[PDB]
Amino acid sequence: IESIIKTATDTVKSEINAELGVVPSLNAVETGATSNTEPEEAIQTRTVINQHGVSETLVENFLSRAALVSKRSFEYKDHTSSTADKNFFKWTINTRSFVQLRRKLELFTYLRFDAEITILTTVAVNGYVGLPDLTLQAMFVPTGALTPEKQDSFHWQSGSNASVFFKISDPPARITIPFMCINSAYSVFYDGFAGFEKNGLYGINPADTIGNLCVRIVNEHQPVGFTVTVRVYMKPKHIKAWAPRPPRTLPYMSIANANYKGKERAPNALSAIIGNRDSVKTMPHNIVN
Amino acid sequence: IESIIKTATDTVKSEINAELGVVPSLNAVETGATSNTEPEEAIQTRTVINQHGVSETLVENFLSRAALVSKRSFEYKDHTSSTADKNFFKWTINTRSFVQLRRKLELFTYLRFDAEITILTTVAVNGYVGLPDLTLQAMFVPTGALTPEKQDSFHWQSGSNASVFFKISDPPARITIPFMCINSAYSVFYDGFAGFEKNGLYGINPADTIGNLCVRIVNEHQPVGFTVTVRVYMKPKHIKAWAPRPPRTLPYMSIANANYKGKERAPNALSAIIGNRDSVKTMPHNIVN
Amino acid sequence: NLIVPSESSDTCSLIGFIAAKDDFSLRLMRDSPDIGQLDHLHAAEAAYQ
Amino acid sequence: SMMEINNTESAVGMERLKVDISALTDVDQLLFNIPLDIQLDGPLRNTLVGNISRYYTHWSGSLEMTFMFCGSFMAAGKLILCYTPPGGSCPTTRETAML
Amino acid sequence: INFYKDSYAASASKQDFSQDPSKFTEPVVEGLKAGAPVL
Amino acid sequence: INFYKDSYAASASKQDFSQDPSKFTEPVVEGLKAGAPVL
Amino acid sequence: SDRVLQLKLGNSAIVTQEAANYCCAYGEWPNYLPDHEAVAIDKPTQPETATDRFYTLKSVKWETGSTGWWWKLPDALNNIGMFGQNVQHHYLYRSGFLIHVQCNATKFHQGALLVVAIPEHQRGAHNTNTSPGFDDIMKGEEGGTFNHPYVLDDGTSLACATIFPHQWINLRTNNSATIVLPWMNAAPMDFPLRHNQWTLAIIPVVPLGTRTTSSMVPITVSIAPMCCEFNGLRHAIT
Amino acid sequence: SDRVLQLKLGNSAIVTQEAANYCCAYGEWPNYLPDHEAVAIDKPTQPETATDRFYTLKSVKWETGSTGWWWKLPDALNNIGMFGQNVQHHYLYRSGFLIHVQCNATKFHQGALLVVAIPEHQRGAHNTNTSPGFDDIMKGEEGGTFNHPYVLDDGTSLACATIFPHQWINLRTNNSATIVLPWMNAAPMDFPLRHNQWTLAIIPVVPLGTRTTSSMVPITVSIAPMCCEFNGLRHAIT
Ligand SMILES: CC(C)Oc1ccc(CNc2cccc3c(-c4ccc(C#N)nc4)ccnc23)cc1
């Protein structure tokens, strides 16, 4: 039954049991149900009024904290002779690059949420003059819009694209992107192929495509070079989640897929996820006095 | 009929049709009316309760986002020997210079709105010393007012002109200009001549003249030179729009006119706006498996 | 078949039109790829002179 | 608004806005097709629905195509216009398209 | 939030959901019918 | 505090205390009993 | 009483005398798409008993070395009977499934099968950066075999797969498993040739053992689509 | 007003601007089989819009020497679309038909087609004692041509064929004919591969004539099954 649960369940006192035909510790795992054996059935209990709150395990609280999704460093310099991110970069938006957020999200099959984005920028002098207070432009370039080819291309005039202009001395730039799947939920996993032909990508729902984040320095280059690093954080909010999954055990290999190899030896080897003990009779950290 | 529309229309279920004298898929384009054939008339439909909102295609939302209208770079230096924008510039206000805003606005014949203006300033050291925190003055100089001739001319004392003084380390300077046409709407297109004689300009309604934006650095020059770039953004708000138009296909040539040449070859050549396919029987991206 | 008499033109034309119906909806505004510029336009520099 | 269905070389200017139909001596022949990809540069792109929709990334809802016959009063004929939901190739024979 | 004295200073008015597409789709003096042929 | 016009701009919704773990722990068509053996 | 079950759908019936209840995934039951959730506006075909019936796949042999088996839905059924003909002629499909898995042996045999329905079972490849190809994923009626059932071929784990809708076949206890699957997708309908909603997985966590004379011990899979809808009638892709 | 007609069935529509009313055979309309007339007790499949739609056959050329054409129902449709797949998978079938026959020419052309639906059109052979063979009768989508339309290939007469449900196409007057056929059988259902309920016949009683430049003048046949039911699901005969 669906019910409102704010605290852990109370324990009732229980007596001795000796009833024929009543056998609450016996179960049948083959049904696929979990054991319904209560502690009051397994042992004699006392009454316990339980006050422990359950708010910290809410899916909202579990997922709605800001995580790094993108980090890029580029040279802020005169690029006339470079081969390179020439005072700007383009990022194809994804959540698979940083394993801590990736593993948390992949505990679920379908997710619906809005994304709070924070952009943190940092600058160092290339191998000192002090640090300049640069202006940056982040521009969202949706599917089928033209991405900028140059720091000063006219794409940056941004007539209809969302842009945010922000300083390095400011607090980190912050915006919310709405839930923008063409379905009612994002497909965290996708057992399918993106195209009507056979050559399309496995494992990525086309319905979930966000677009590109294009970031430039707005200033003309200075006489000396700098490295600029941009960090993007995403925080899910107003979250719905469906069909929880076995967590990732093996190290990730790629952002394109669930391909797996494991560590050379346990823990998280393909052959052994838990580290070995000497025998099933060995207690590894046994208390001895 | 004028009505309040917030969501797309619902679909009703439809049955088989076989009525003499009733022929809803036939039409007459020569009246100038668009086809009134409904889907329930053309095929058997199911009932669909349609929830899709129409708010993002509101003319307010379509136009009311900030677009670059003016960008100017000048040298901040000792100009005693220069030929040049000598620590200040004057801009004759127009919307025709940046094609993304220009094309959006030109989807309409008449527009009435207020303009939110944002001024973003950036500085680089000329070919490093760090970047100075300069004070700038933007002064609106209406029609028939005197424009400044020098960085320190007395015109800048601004007894009755609107001026805004702003720092480079500040957030971008922001003001609203009211809707200020001497008519009830701006003329986005004007099939006329500005003067009572024949030599006046074609294509610009005199009623729409805004004036000049004059921008100086307020500081005395430093011992070293800098480049300052000023970017002006305009956001229409409180918008009314009348008589939508065929969009611009050919690349713009000039800010003075609608003159057209096209690209050398399709797309958007004068002779061919859509790129060619091999025949009217060729399906260019045909699915083959 | 297209069937015509001798004094009609032997070849005839269709014009095709398209529109959205009132169930049509659009989402997620972007810059249109139908327009661009490489240089400044003519007389744009002159607005500063 | 008019589709540029005849987006072929040697159609010049206004000629790209009309499709010419001739009498045939073989039954049930294909006359033309129309690609429906509004994002790519096809007959639908330079239309009112086309040019406005390309400021946006997502779309939903029905499209109407209307064809005006511009032969003489004495011209007669019957055509079949077919929409094929996606999944396979564009049909090349009437017995396939009429499904 | 608007503490300015001029009402043109305000934020944008995104609530005008009135449409009349028939002035562009059906400017015919005799309105079209569904149950009858146009001409 | 939310002065933005779109409701998706809001702060997070941490008040949804509804649970139904039985859809994951007991998706059996005949519900289990305490006082009777499972099979 | 919870050990005997009859499932009747269309012209097909299954009886079992040794069930262990049955699973309704997430407590759901299959339903047709309601009007407040519909997208496609053409009137759907609903073939009922022509599609909503048990199809029995080719049986597989449970051997001492068996790693387990999988079949993807709708792919495994896309070429079978009137269900296959409707998927071939229609762009869009929606249905549930009733899955019945069958494996009898003697009272001197032992062994346990995990029978689990996995939503969006996006496979990984082993020890490569290249994503699984089309022919690795799309197997049809034959289905595939597990490469590494211990990570479910996806770098996760078998031990936690009981979070998905499942039963067991424990040869001591029961000879069949039943799982009822609702429609499980983020969209209300899908193109059946390029996305699989469900993977059936059968994994021998305890191997088959006996000391009587060996016999072939097959595992048999019967799947009935439930509440089939199809939209976007055209020619057959086929 | 009786000259313009739109017929809409499923995803298909036909408009005509030059009809001559339309015929409802014997004043009937197609209906599904009621319970008080049913024989077969399995629940029927009723595919609706997947089957109940216009199928357009290959057009035939009207020439000065043409004797006329015929198509048998259900045979001409037994291999077309989801109608054909259901007849192939089911022992029993029932439906009506809506038949639309199309033939335009110029105002300088003349000619008249008798368009007639003949129930139980059991053919004769000419000048032999041997009965017509299977390949003489079963023609599929192509249909056949008349050997002797003056006796309707059955030793009766063309002059009296107006007792059957018919219209005319008189090129002076109209360019299309429409006939709605009920279920017309002594049994409530039939096996569609061995009995044809209806023969469509198109006979040029007045030959095509003009003195303008000649063009090919095709005749086109579109047939929509109406209220399709199928019983006795099994494998496809096909
Ligand atoms: C430049 C400014 C004005 O616009 C911007 C700024 C930044 C961004 C970057 N956003 C984003 C970065 C990374 C992920 C997302 C997602 C997302 C997350 C998880 C899942 C799952 N499972 N699916 C989708 C949704 C929306 N956004 C995202 C986009 C637009």
Ligand SMILES: CC(C)Oc1ccc(CNc2cccc3c(-c4ccc(C#N)nc4)ccnc23)cc1
């Ligand atoms: C220095 C401060 C205090 O004052 C300032 C600051 C900046 C400005 C620059 N404004 C402006 C720049 C560009 C355009 C406009 C328009 C306008 C837009 C579109 C159409 C059309 N179709 N028609 C008129 C109206 C008012 N303004 C404008 C003017 C005065």
